[PDB]
């Protein structure tokens, strides 16, 4: 739901959404790969 | 969970290689790790 | 206290006999609640 | 100590990071932790 949400709020607002009591894979985020720049800072998105 | 036989491991992503045992140490409930001086990971708690 | 959107509460439910003032004595205070909310607080008031 | 490096533990610099990161980071550890020995060694020699 975080990506496929409808409107995204303007910048001077925004929503910090807890995603918790759950399992989150990162492939479906990462390996979907239509993502212009997926730029990690600390982590290496394979390691996730 | 292999015990008292040298194993690699990962608990909740906190990794290392150790000889896992059972322990008299009594956590306070909220806690997760232990430590000792070196930034050791001394004790842990079976996550499941 | 509120640390960067979290919130903490510690406790003792502990006995005393004095009318006027604190028993002078030491007690540690282990957490009961931990809430990584994200609210801020500048002020407050109790209830009765 | 982090010696300026972005973490204390080697693995967590290993895991999290891309080698061209890890390399430049892992130096700071090494160069630091190395130099810590030469201090500790010299202290021995002088003391011993
Ligand atoms: C894992 O399952 C056991 C039931 O056998 C349960 O007691 C335990 O709470 C579960 N783990 C977690 C993290 O809830």
Task: List, as one string, the DSSP characters of B1-48.
Answer: ---SS-EEEEETTEEEEE----------TT-----BTTTB--------
Residue C16 structure tokens: 């005393």
D11 vs B contacts (CB less than 8 Å): 15-16
C-alpha closest to that of C8 among C45, C41, C46: C41
Pocket of ligand 1 (CB under 6 A): B 47-48
Contact C28, C47 (CB under 8 A): no
Q: CA torsion C8→C13→C17→C21, rounded to 10°?
A: 10
Which is the closest atom of ligand 1 to the Cα of B48? Answer: 11
C-alpha closest to that of D26 among D39, D16, D41, D37: D16
Contact B12, B33 (CB under 8 A): no
**CA torsion sign, A16 to A17 to A23 to A29?**
negative
Residue D15 touches chain A, beta carbons under 8 Å: yes
HEC string of C5-47 equals CCCEEECCCCCCCCCCCCCCCCCCCCEEEECCCCCCCCCCCCC
User: How many Å lie between the centroid of ligand 1 and the Cα of residue A22?
Assistant: 14
Against chain D, the chains showing at least 3 CB pairs within 8 Å are: A, B
**B9 CB neighbour count, 10 Å cutoff:** 15
Interstrand relation of B14-18 and C31-34 (parallel, antiparallel or unpaired) = unpaired
C-alpha closest to that of B2 among B41, B31, B10, B24: B10
Question: What residues contact C11, with CB distance under 8 A and at least 6 apart?
Answer: C29, C30, C31, C32
Q: Which of B15, B16, B39 sits opposite D8 (nearest CB)?
A: B39
Q: What is the stated resolution of the deposited model, in angstroms?
A: 3.5
Q: Do C34 and B28 touch (CB under 8 A)?
A: no
Method used to solve the structure: cryo-EM
User: How many Å lie between the centroid of ligand 1 and the Cα of residue D19?
Assistant: 37
Grouping H, G, I as helix, E, B as strand and the rest as coil, residue A27 is helix
D6 vs A contacts (CB less than 8 Å): 42
C-alpha closest to that of C35 among C4, A21, B34: C4
State how far the alpha carbon of B28 is from the alpha carbons of A35, B20, B46, D5, D32, in Å.
44, 20, 14, 32, 36
Distance (Å) from the C-alpha of residue C34 to the closest C-alpha of chain B? 9
Q: Which residue of D has its CA nearest to B15?
A: D11
**D25 CB neighbour count, 10 Å cutoff:** 22
């Amino acid at each position: 739901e975080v990506f496929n949400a409808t409107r995204f709020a303007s910048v001077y607002a925004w929503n910090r959404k807890r995603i918790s009591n759950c399992v989150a894979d990162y492939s479906v985020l990462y390996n979907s790969a239509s993502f212009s720049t997926f730029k990690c800072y600390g982590v290496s998105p394979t390691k996730l | 969970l292999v015990k008292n036989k040298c194993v690699n491991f990962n608990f909740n992503g906190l990794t290392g290689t150790g000889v896992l045992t059972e322990s008299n140490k009594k956590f306070l409930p909220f806690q997760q790790f232990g430590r000792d001086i070196a930034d050791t990971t001394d004790a842990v708690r079976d996550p499941q | 206290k509120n640390i960067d959107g979290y919130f903490k509460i510690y406790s003792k439910h502990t006995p005393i006999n004095l009318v006027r003032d604190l028993p002078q004595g030491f007690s540690a205070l282990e957490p009961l609640v931990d809430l990584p909310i994200g609210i801020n607080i500048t002020r407050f008031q109790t209830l009765l | 100590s982090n010696f300026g490096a972005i973490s204390s533990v080697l693995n967590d610099i290993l895991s999290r990071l891309d080698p061209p990161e890890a390399e430049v980071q892992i130096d700071r550890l090494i160069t630091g932790r190395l130099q810590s020995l030469q201090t500790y060694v010299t202290q021995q020699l002088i003391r011993a």
